[PDB]
Symmetry: D3
Subunit: 230 residues, 6 copies
C-alpha cells in the first residue's frame, strides 16, 4: 500500500508499539505477542501483528532519527488507520539524578531538528505526548509498581553532537534523556487527531556514562499494559 509498507489496511492493529531496532521488534513480537504474524518487512522493518491478552496489537521498527519515524508514523495513521503509537526503546540519560537502567516516560520532547519549525510556520511547536498515553503509561507503571521517571525528553538529529555544551544546558533544565524520534512522532499524531507516547530505558548516560534486560522487560510490561488500558 505504501512505499515502505507492503501490508494493507486492516493488517495493523489500532495500537502499534515501535522501536528503532527491527530485530528488537522481532524479538518483542516473538516474546510477548501470541500468534504473531509478519505483516510488513519492506526494508527489513520487521512489522508484526498478533495479540496481547486477546487484543490486536502490532509491533514494528521505525529506524533511527526523526525523518525515519516520521515516514512510518504518518503512513500508519493515514493509510493503516492506526490510532495509537507507543514508542518503546532506549535513550541516553542527561540529568545527573537519572542513572543507566532507569525507565523514563516522556511528557514531551525538545529537538535540534527543523521539522517541527517547517510544519509550524517557523514557530515553537511543543512536541507533546498524548495526555491519554502519558497517563496510561504512568498508571501501568503505578499498578505494576515499577519506578519510572516522568518528564522532558530530547530528540537529537546528531547522536554525535558537535555542540558539547548542549548536554549541560539540558541538565540545567532537567531534561531526563535523549533519543531520536519522539519530537517527530508527537506532532504527526496531533495532525491526524490520533495518539502517541514514548517510554524508554536508559542504556547510557551522556554526562558520565556508568541486568540491562531486566529494565527492558519492565519497560515492555508497562507499554503492553498501557496499550490494553488504551
Amino acid at each position: 500500500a505504501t512505499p515502505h509498507n507492503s501490508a494493507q489496511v486492516g493488517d495493523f492493529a489500532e495500537t502499534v508499539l515501535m522501536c528503532g531496532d527491527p530485530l528488537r521488534a522481532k524479538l518483542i513480537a516473538e516474546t510477548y505477542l501470541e500468534n504473531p504474524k509478519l505483516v510488513n518487512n519492506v526494508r527489513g522493518i520487521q512489522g508484526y501483528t498478533g495479540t496481547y491478552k486477546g487484543k490486536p496489537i502490532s509491533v514494528m521498527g521505525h529506524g533511527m532519527g526523526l525523518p525515519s519515524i516520521c515516514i512510518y508514523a504518518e503512513e500508519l495513521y493515514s493509510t493503516y488507520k492506526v490510532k495509537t503509537i507507543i514508542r518503546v526503546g532506549t535513550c541516553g540519560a542527561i540529568d545527573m539524578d537519572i542513572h543507566t537502567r532507569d525507565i523514563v516516560i516522556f511528557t514531551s520532547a525538545g529537538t535540534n531538528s527543523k521539522i517541527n519549525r517547517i510544519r509550524f510556520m517557523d514557530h515553537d511547536y511543543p512536541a507533546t505526548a498524548s495526555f491519554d498515553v502519558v497517563c496510561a503509561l504512568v498508571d501501568a507503571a503505578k499498578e505494576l509498581n515499577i519506578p519510572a521517571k516522568v518528564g522532558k525528553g530530547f530528540s537529537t538529529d546528531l547522536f554525535y553532537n558537535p555542540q558539547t555544551e548542549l548536554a549541560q544546558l539540558m541538565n540545567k533544565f532537567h531534561f531526563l534523556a535523549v533519543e531520536m524520534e519522539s519530537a517527530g512522532l508527537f506532532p504527526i499524531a496531533d495532525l491526524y487527531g490520533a495518539r502517541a507516547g514514548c517510554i524508554c530505558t536508559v542504556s547510557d548516560h551522556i554526562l558520565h556514562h556508568e541486568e540491562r534486560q531486566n529494565s527492558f522487560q519492565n519497560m515492555m510490561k508497562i507499554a503492553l499494559e498501557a496499550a490494553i488500558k488504551l
Copy 2:
C-alpha cells in the same frame, strides 16, 4: 527585595496563583482567601497572601506577555523560594470543538516568542507544564466532576496577530487555546527545579467568536483544590 516586589522572603506562600489582571487577583484574594494580606503592590501588581483551607497561599498578577510573567516567575522561584506557580486566567479557543466558557488545562504551550530559543541554544524547547501540576489540576477537575479539556496551548507575542493563517494551522494540529504567558513560565520552573501549570477559561473563540463567571468560579475551584493537593 526585588525591582518588582517590595515583599521579603517568607511573605509569599510556596504556592502562588497568578493571572494577568491585577484586579482579578485582588478579587480572587478577597473572594477565596481567608485573612488575605497585601504583601506586594509594586506597579499595582496586587500581590496577596492568605490561606485556603488552612494552608498558606498567595495570589498575584503577572501582567500580559511572556516577558512580563518571566520577570515575576523568576523572582518568585529564585528570591521568594516559591515552589509552585499555577497560572489562572482566560484564553482564546482555537480548536473548533472548543467553545467559549470551556475550561482548558495546558499540558504544554507553543509560542512565536524567541525567549525559549534564546535560553535553549536556538533549539526547540518544549514548554511543558509540570506533570505533577497537570495531574493535580486534572484530578481536582475529576473529583469536582467539572468538564475540562486537556492539551496544547499557545502563548503568543501578538494578541493582534498579522499572520492570519496561523490560527487555522493551529486548529489543524489541535491546539486548544491561546494566551500569553505559559510558554515563558514553564521553562523557568524547570530551571529552578520547581513547578508550574496553567488552567484557563475560554473567554473568546478566534476562529468564529460566539454565565461567564460561572465558568471562572469553576476554574478557580479546580486551581484552588489542586493547590491543596500539591
Copy 3:
C-alpha cells in the same frame, strides 16, 4: 470598546504618555495634569485624560514587555484614533559613559524579540522613533536646557538575560540603555501612519550599577513640553 479598554472613541487625547508602572501613570496624572479623569482602568491600567497648558492629553500604563505595550498601542492608534504616543519611564544604562539618573532619548531600539521579524517577513526592521517626536523631545530638552543623551536603546524580552555577553556587545556598539517596550511601539506607529517616541531616566546600570525623582521630573518636563510642541 476593546478587550483592554472600557473607554470610547474620544475619551483619549490624540497624544498619550505611557509608562510601564500604572501607579506611576496615576501619579503623573495627579501631579502634572489639570482636571484629570479616569477614562480606563481595565486591569488597573490607570488610563487618565486631562489637560496640560490647556491642551488635551492622556496618560496610561502599558505594562512590561513588547507583547504588552503592543496591545495597548495598537488599540490606541486603531480604535481611539490616537496620533502620538510618547513612552516615558525608566531603563538600564549599558554604555559606560551613561550613569544612573541620566536621561536618554531613543532614536531607535534594537531587540531580542521575534515580533518585528514576524511582521517584517523575517527581515531586519529598524524600530525607529518618529523623527518628529525625537526632534520635539530634543528641542524640549534644549529649550529647558536639560542634558539628555540621544541614541540607540534596546528592548529586551528577558529582564534577567541568560546571555551575559550581550551587555558588553551592546556597550561596544554604544547602545545607551535597555528597557522593554520601544522596539514594539515604533513599528506599530509606522503601520498606522502615526507617531511614537521614548524618553527614559536611567534607574540602574547593568555593567556596574552605582535625587532619583529629580531626574524623573526633568524627564517628565521634557515629555510634556514636547507633547505640546507636537
Copy 4:
C-alpha cells in the same frame, strides 16, 4: 566496537557502498560481491565485506534520513578507518526533464535539515560530493557508456513534505532529485578528510509520477567500477 556496529577495525573495506534498504544491501552483497561475509548486523543493518575484481569492498544499509546515515558514516570514517563511502540507492525526480528510471550523480545536495547549520555556525554549508568520487562515478558512466545526469540533489527531512510549493521552487533551480541522506554524508566526509559520493536511480517523479531493476543494475555497475577506480 560502536553502539551500532559489532565489527572491529579492519572488518570493513576502505570503500563502502551504502543504501537505505538493508535487504537491498544484502542483495547487493550476494549479487555482486565474491565471498561476502556478514561483518555487522546490529539492528539488522546487513553489513557485509567481500571483494569485487579482487579488491576489498563492503556494503551496508544506512537507514532513512540524515540523522541515520550520519551515525553510520561518522563511525565508519572515525572508528573503522573507512576512506570512501559511495551512497547507492533510489530518489525522486524533481526536474521535469528527469524521468523515472533515470540515473543521477549528485554534485552536491541541498536540505531542509538543520544539521549542517548546527555544525557550521548557522551558516550555509555546501554539502558537496568529493570531486574525486564525482569524477570516478562519471568516468565509470562514460566508460560503460551509461547515460547519467549530473547535478544537484536535495536531502529532505520530510518524505511527506507539508511545503508543497518547494517541489516547484526546486524545479525552477533545476535540482535533479530528492533523497534523504547525501546532505548529511558529505560534510562528515569533509570533517574526516575522507571521501563521499552518491548515485541514485529515479524510482518516482514528485511533479507528475509516471524494467526498473535494469536501471538499478546499471547504477550498481557504475558505483562498483567507480569504487575500483578509487
Copy 5:
C-alpha cells in the same frame, strides 16, 4: 595601507562623502571640490581629497551592496581615522507618496542582509543614522529650503528581489526608499564611535515607476553644507 586603499593615514579628510558609482565620485570631486587630488584608485574606486569652503573633504566610491561599503567604511574609520561618512546617491522609492526625483534623508535602514545579525548575536540591530548627521542633513535642507523627506530606508541584498510581496509590506510600514549600503554603514560607525548618515535622490519607483540632475545637485548641496556643519 589597506588591501583596498593605497593612500596613507592623513590622505583622507575626516569627513568623506561616498556613493556607489566611482565615476559619480570623480564627477563630484571635479564639480564641487577645489584642488581635488586622487588619493586612492585601487579598483578604480576613485578616491579624492580636496576642499569645500576651505575645509578638507574626501569623496570616494563604495561599490554596490552591504559587503562592499562595509569594507571601505571599516578601513576608513579604523585605518584612515575618518570621523564622518555621509553616503550620497540614488535609491528606489517604495512609499506611494514618494515620487521619482524626490530627496530622502534616512533616519535608519532595514535590511534582508544577515550581516547585522552576525555582529549582534542574531538579534535585531537597529541600523541607525548618527543623530548628528541626520540633524546636520535636515538643517542644511531647511537652511537651503530644499524639500526632503526624512524616514526609514531599506538596504537590500537583492536588487532583483524574488520576494515580490516585500515591496508592498514596506509600503504599509512607510519605508521611504531602497538602496544597498546604509544598513551596513551605520553599525560600523557605531562600533568605531564615529558617525554615518545617508541622503539619496529617488531615481525610480518600485511600486509604479513613473531634470533628474537638478534633484541630484540639490542633494549634493545638502550633503556638502551638512558636512561643513559637522
Copy 6:
C-alpha cells in the same frame, strides 16, 4: 539596456570572464583579448568584448560582494543572453595545506549571506559550480599541467569577520579559500538554466598569512582555455 549596463543584446559574448577589480578586467582585456572593445562602462565597470583564439569573449568587473555580482550576473543571463560566466580573481586561503600563490577551482561555495536562504524558502541551497565549467577548468589545468586545488570555497559578507572562530571551523571542514561572490553567482546560473564557475589565485592566507603575477597569468590561462572548451 539595464540600470548597470549601457550595452545592448549581442554586445556581450556568450562567455564572460568576471573579476572584482574593474582595472584588472581592463588589464585582462588588453593583455589577452584581440581587438577588445569597451561595450559597457556604467559605473566604471570596464566591460569589454573581444576574441580569444578567434572566439567571441567578454570580460567585465563585478564589484565586491554577493549583492554586487548578483546584479551583473542576473542581467547578463537574462538580458544579454550570456550562457557562461567564469569568475576569475583572488581569494584568501583557509586550509593550512593551501599556500599563497596557489590556484583554486571551486566545486561550490558556502556563505554567511542570507541571499540563498531568501531565494530557497529558508533552506540550505548548495551553491554549486556548473559541473561542465568545473570539468573544463580542471581539464584545462591538466592539459596545461598547472597544479590547482579543487574544492569548497566560502563567499563571505564580511571581509573583516567579527566571528574569529569561523576560520578554524572552516579549516576543520577543509574549505580551500574565501572570496565574496561565488555563492551568489552559482544559484543565479541555475535559475537561468545557464552555467557558472570560479577559479582563484590565493593572494593571502587568513590563518597565518605568509612572483604573484605568475600565479595569476597561469590562472588566466586556465580560465581562457576552459572558456574555449566550453
